[PDB]
Structures are given as C-alpha cells and as structure tokens.
Amino acid sequence: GESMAQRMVWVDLEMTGLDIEKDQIIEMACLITDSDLNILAEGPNLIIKQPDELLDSMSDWCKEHHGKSGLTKAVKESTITLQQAEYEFLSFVRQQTPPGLCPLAGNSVHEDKKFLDKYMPQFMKHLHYRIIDVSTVKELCRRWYPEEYEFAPKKAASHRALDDISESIKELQFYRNNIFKKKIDEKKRKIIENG
Numbered sequence: 316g317e318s319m320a321q322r323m324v325w326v327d328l329e330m331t332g333l334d335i336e337k338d339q340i341i342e343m344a345c346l347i348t349d350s351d352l353n354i355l356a357e358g359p360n361l362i363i364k365q366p367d368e369l370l371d372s373m374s375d376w377c378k379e380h381h382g383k384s385g386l387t388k389a390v391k392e393s394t395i396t397l398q399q400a401e402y403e404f405l406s407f408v409r410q411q412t413p414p415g416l417c418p419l420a421g422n423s424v425h426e427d428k429k430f431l432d433k434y435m436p437q438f439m440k441h442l443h444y445r446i447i448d449v450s451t452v453k454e455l456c457r458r459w460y461p462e463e464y465e466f467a468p469k470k471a472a473s474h475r476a477l478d479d480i481s482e483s484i485k486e487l488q489f490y491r492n493n494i495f496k497k498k499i500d501e502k503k504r505k506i507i508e509n510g
C-alpha cells in the first residue's frame with residue numbers, strides 16, 4: 316500500500332522548443348523509483364516522429380543541440396507516433412504505480428508536465444498532480460547550503476532523455492545525503508546496542 320503509493324515516476328522529455336502552442340515532444344524516457352530513489356523498473360525510452368517542417372523551423376538552440384546529439388536525425392526516421400508512445404508509457408505506469416497516487420519527478424519537471432498534460436493526458440491521468448521537482452531542492456540548496464552546493468555532481472547535460480533522468484536522480488540523492496538531516500538506520504542501531 317504505502318510503499319507503492321510512495322513510488323516516483325521519473326520522466327524527462329526532449330521537445331522541439333519551449334512554445335506550448337506549437338512545439339512537440341520528440342523524446343521521452345521514464346523509470347520508476349521507490350521512495351528512497353532506488354530504480355525499480357525501466358520504462359520505454361522512445362523517439363517520437365514529428366514533421367520535417369517543425370524540425371526545420373526549430374530555434375537555433377534546438378537545431379544545434381538536437382542536431383549534434385543525433386536526435387533530429389532519429390526523429391525523422393522514427394515510426395513511433397505520439398499516440399503509440401503515450402500508450403507505451405501509460406501501460407508501463409499502470410504496471411508499476413497505483414492509479415492517481417504517484418508524482419512526476421525530475422529537474423524542472425513542471426515543464427515536462429505542461430507538455431504531458433497537453434499531449435499525453437491519459438498518461439497524466441494515472442499520476443498525482445504533485446511533482447518532485449529536483450530543481451526546487453537545487454534552488455533551496457543554493458540559498459540555504461551554499462558550501463554544500465559547490466560539491467553537487469557535475470552534469471553532462473546531453474539533452475537526451477534517459478541519460479538526463481539518471482543525472483536528476485543523482486542530484487536529488489546528493490541533496491538527501493548532504494543537506495537533509497541524518498536519521499537512524501539498521502546499522503547504527505546495532506552499533507548503539509553494541510556500545
């Protein structure tokens with residue numbers, strides 16, 4: 316019960332840009348962690364077909380970044396429609412999380428949520444409305460723990476979906492281990508008794 320409801324649905328998307336009125340999802344990856352950030356299951360990792368005209372009119376930033384990562388070429392070759400991709404993700408979360416109870420998780424994952432609410436609404440219906448925004452914790456770390464903030468892991472920032480999920484989890488793990496308060500565990504309790 317509670318353990319299942321405390322899972323997290325980590326997602327990262329690539330889009331043709333930041334304009335919700337025109338831009339589209341071109342890559343999406345998803346995995347599930349338990350409440351303690353251990354990966355329980357790897358979900359689909361999909362490159363979604365979108366029209367040539369849209370890719371050709373992307374911002375210079377997106378042309379450069381999705382170009383050099385290979386993503387633009389892979390979008391043009393993709394046979395995966397948005398609808399089929401959404402189904403794969405929805406089927407996956409239906410196997411992994413109780414309906415309505417688990418949040419999206421990632422860095423500034425509200426941006427992903429904005430695109431998913433519009434373009435994958437049935438996927439989003441399986442999830443809670445709250446999010447685990449790693450960048451909220453980042454912004455609190457920078458303010459409240461400036462010394463510790465300097466030791467956060469460096470990110471490769473490849474703008475590819477699955478690799479970026481792993482970096483997001485690693486960042487949150489860093490904050491848990493370095494700016495949240497310490498707690499008892501099985502090993503410390505056995506030592507306390509032994510002393």
Ligand code: NA
Pocket residue numbers: 327328421422479
């Ligand atoms: Na992202």
